[PDB]
């Protein structure tokens, strides 16, 4: 994976590629790595695919119950604290590397969590196999006082660096923008720069090509 997070004027934006690997094989060419913890707290995930999904859903569930219990919108630090303490308890065996971001009554926030439970604060962050390709772009082009449109551009450029230069990353760019005082907009497949070219030939077989031994109607009804 490649995943990033970039702070801007009135909020925060996160982005991710959409490649899912199994050894050297691309298992999913368009998987979703951006996860909704709460309506305005979103999470980019790298590492063990099941773990990033499971841990983000569990904390997201507990956050929802907490929000209902306290009659308050949930805070990013709550998700951060709950995620890190869970991961730390499992001593890195839950291989989830997360970029946590969102807006809450306190303001806009951007954090990263590693599998062993350490957290980091920053204006721009990147995680995953293609984090070095992404971070190179971020270190080259990031500045203070970014606008919304500038932060999206910088974030998607950082993902692209990973897509092209890292074999662990590829396909499309997903983005989620979390601005203060507005609804969070999830931009699924924000960029699709890896469209498959038309095949040279149709491999539609003549009907009857496959040799058949038996046929039978299967009963699905009661």
């Amino acid at each position: 994976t490649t995943i990033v997070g970039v702070k801007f004027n009135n909020g925060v934006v996160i982005a991710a590629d959409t490649r899912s690997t199994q050894g050297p094989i691309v298992a999913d060419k368009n998987c979703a790595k951006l996860h909704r913890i709460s309506p305005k707290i979103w999470c980019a995930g790298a590492g063990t695919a099941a773990d990033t999904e499971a841990v983000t859903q569990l904390i997201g569930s507990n956050i929802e119950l907490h929000s209902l219990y306290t009659s308050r919108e949930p805070r990013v630090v709550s998700a951060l604290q709950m995620l890190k303490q869970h991961l730390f308890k499992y001593q890195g065996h839950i291989g989830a590397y997360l970029i946590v971001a969102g807006v809450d009554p306190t303001g806009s926030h951007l954090f990263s969590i590693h599998a062993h439970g350490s957290t980091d604060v920053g204006y721009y962050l990147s995680l995953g196999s293609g984090s070095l390709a992404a971070m190179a772009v971020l270190e080259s082009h990031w500045k203070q006082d970014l606008t919304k449109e500038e932060a999206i551009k910088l974030a998607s450029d950082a993902i692209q660096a990973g897509i092209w230069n890292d074999l662990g990353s590829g396909s499309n760019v997903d983005v989620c923008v979390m601005e203060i005082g507005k609804d969070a907009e999830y931009l699924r497949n924000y960029l699709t720069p890896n469209v498959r070219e038309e095949k040279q030939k149709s491999y539609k077989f003549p009907r009857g090509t496959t040799a058949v031994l038996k046929e039978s109607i299967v009963n699905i009804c009661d």
Partner: protein, 233 residues
């Protein structure tokens, strides 16, 4: 079977319209200790080739001596040693590439990653990589160590394929290299601020720049970063 002791980090390089640029910092690390600071890891051979070497420094110095001796040997009984029968980058590379693979095949490698940058006699740019395994490859941008992971992505935004080379000037190319060196200083724990840069142009020839420093760095935003999540002070 070796283990590298005193080591040099990334060597980065790229092609541009009239020639090639190569750069490497002046550090000789001893593990985590940043032991030696006056180490030159770019070594010119003649006025048309520069060999950039990373990895073990004792083995680098051995390669220096081999190249120095190669120039001497080429001059013997050679009236055209400073003309038609001068050492080409391709000759120098192939020689090293032969040595690297022979040494890996004897299970006693020269623990290095080498990039040979230069300009051929016909004006063609030469840029090719070789390492301890005898593995070779060529590309519009080449980098070793961390440079491969961080520099190449940045340099490939300038020259992504062959057709981008005539479109890239020496000003633009040098800017990208110097920028890459800054990024490596931010992010490579075995890098130094001081570095050397070399340009081999088909018109202006070899320009060797020493004692360069990374500058125009962004550190101010650090003051705003407090704690690791919940801390406010």
């Amino acid at each position: 079977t070796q283990q590298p002791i005193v080591t040099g980090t990334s060597v980065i390089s790229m092609k541009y319209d009239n020639g090639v640029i190569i750069a490497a910092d002046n550090l000789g690390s001893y593990g985590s200790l940043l032991r030696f600071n006056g180490v030159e890891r770019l070594i010119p051979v003649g006025d048309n080739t520069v060999v950039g070497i990373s990895g073990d420094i004792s083995d680098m110095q051995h390669i220096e001596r081999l190249l120095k001796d190669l120039v001497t040997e080429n001059a013997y009984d050679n009236p055209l040693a400073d003309a038609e029968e001068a050492l080409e980058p391709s000759y120098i590379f192939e020689y090293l590439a032969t040595v690297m693979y022979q040494r890996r095949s004897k299970m006693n490698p020269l623990w290095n990653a080498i990039i040979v940058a230069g300009v051929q006699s016909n004006g063609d740019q030469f840029l090719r990589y070789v390492n301890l395994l005898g593995v070779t490859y060529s590309s519009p941008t080449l980098a070793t160590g961390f440079g491969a992971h961080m520099a190449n992505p940045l340099l490939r935004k300038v020259v992504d394929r062959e057709s981008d080379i005539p479109k890239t000037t020496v000003q633009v190319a040098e800017e990208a290299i110097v920028n890459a060196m800054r990024v490596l200083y931010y992010r490579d724990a075995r890098s130094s601020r001081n570095f050397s840069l070399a340009i081999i142009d088909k018109n202006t020839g070899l320009t060797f720049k020493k004692n360069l420093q990374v500058e125009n760095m962004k550190w101010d935003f650090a003051k705003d970063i407090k704690g690791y999540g919940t801390q406010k002070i």
